[PDB]
């Protein structure tokens, strides 16, 4: 039994070339380069599902510190005041209140200031 | 029971190592052979007994003994075999026609290795002590 390879080889190449669209030059046209590019994009996707959480945490903390200093307190004193009041609101929602509802954020800052002393 | 409904027992039909078929089969890139050296080469591997250039054990140790050529024509008979002699007499050749000793055997012995519960005339054979007691106990007769 002799097995020709061309159909299944063509399918295995077309899958990798389909996952390589948008890439520059031989990275979207040539199987040898596109296979390395697809594996490198996979490594980056694995690393950046971890990196995304870190970056959004950084952004939330920068906006909380911005709006807290707009209200007259630093970040560390404000998070101390929300721990010493037993308030479990995370930093995503605090950044969202810092953007969209500044009076509710002023209420939270007054709560943390009263708890801070 | 049709031909597309039969199937083997589980554990009967293990597949087999195919060597050199990628990362995920476990046996690609040198396939179980490791890296460079004489063993990984095609046709490599040292012969049977080669311990390095160190003197091998079948050459280190002395030779002993000789082959008798008399022990190649001495068979033995178990006590659970002379219930097959077709007649109840044991000779040099009716054992040889009942296919227990072989044609080139001239000397033979009966050995206590089972049970005998029939009268057997054991003629022309050497007999051990316990086999003689276990044949004389079952109502037989051992002559020379």
């Amino acid at each position: 039994a002799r097995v020709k390879r061309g159909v299944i080889a063509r399918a295995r190449h077309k899958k990798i070339l389909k996952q390589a669209k948008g890439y520059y030059g031989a990275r979207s046209r040539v199987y040898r380069v596109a296979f390395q590019a697809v594996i490198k994009a996979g490594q980056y996707a694995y690393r950046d599902r971890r990196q995304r959480k870190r970056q959004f945490r950084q952004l939330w903390i920068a906006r909380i510190n911005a709006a807290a200093r707009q209200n007259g307190i630093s970040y560390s004193k404000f998070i101390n005041g929300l721990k010493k009041a037993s308030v479990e609101i995370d930093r995503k929602i605090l950044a969202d209140i810092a953007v969209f509802d500044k009076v509710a954020f002023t209420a939270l800052v007054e709560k943390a200031k009263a708890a801070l002393a | 029971m049709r031909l597309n409904t039969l199937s083997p027992a589980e554990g009967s039909k293990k597949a087999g190592k195919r060597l050199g078929r990628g990362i995920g089969s476990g046996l690609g890139k040198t396939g179980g052979r490791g890296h460079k050296g004489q063993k990984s080469r095609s046709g490599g591997g040292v012969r049977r007994g080669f311990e390095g250039g160190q003197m091998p054990l079948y050459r280190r140790l002395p030779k002993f003994g000789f082959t008798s050529r008399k022990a190649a024509i001495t068979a033995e008979i178990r006590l659970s075999d002379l219930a097959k002699v077709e007649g109840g007499v044991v000779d040099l050749n009716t054992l040889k026609a009942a296919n227990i000793i072989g044609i080139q055997i001239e000397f033979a012995k009966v050995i206590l290795a089972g049970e005998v519960t029939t009268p057997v005339t054991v003629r022309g054979l050497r007999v051990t002590k316990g086999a003689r007691a276990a044949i004389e106990a079952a109502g037989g007769k051992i002559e020379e």
Partner: protein
């Protein structure tokens, strides 16, 4: 192609009842007169092959 025995191994090892091999001891052919009698007396009887050497002996003797 039937397997051939290493014929110099068939003259130095004999198979026992559990499947081991007996062999004659070395150091008992010549300069004996400087060897003590206790040493040569222990070198006379046969010994069994050790654990590490059984693989080599079994490979050398397929039909034993």
């Amino acid at each position: 192609p039937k397997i051939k025995t290493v014929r110099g191994a068939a003259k130095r090892f004999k198979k026992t009842g559990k499947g081991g091999f007996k062999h004659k001891h070395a150091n008992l052919r010549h300069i004996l007169t400087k060897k003590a009698t206790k040493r040569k007396r222990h070198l006379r009887p046969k010994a069994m092959v050790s654990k590490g050497d059984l693989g080599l002996v079994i490979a050398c003797l397929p039909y034993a």
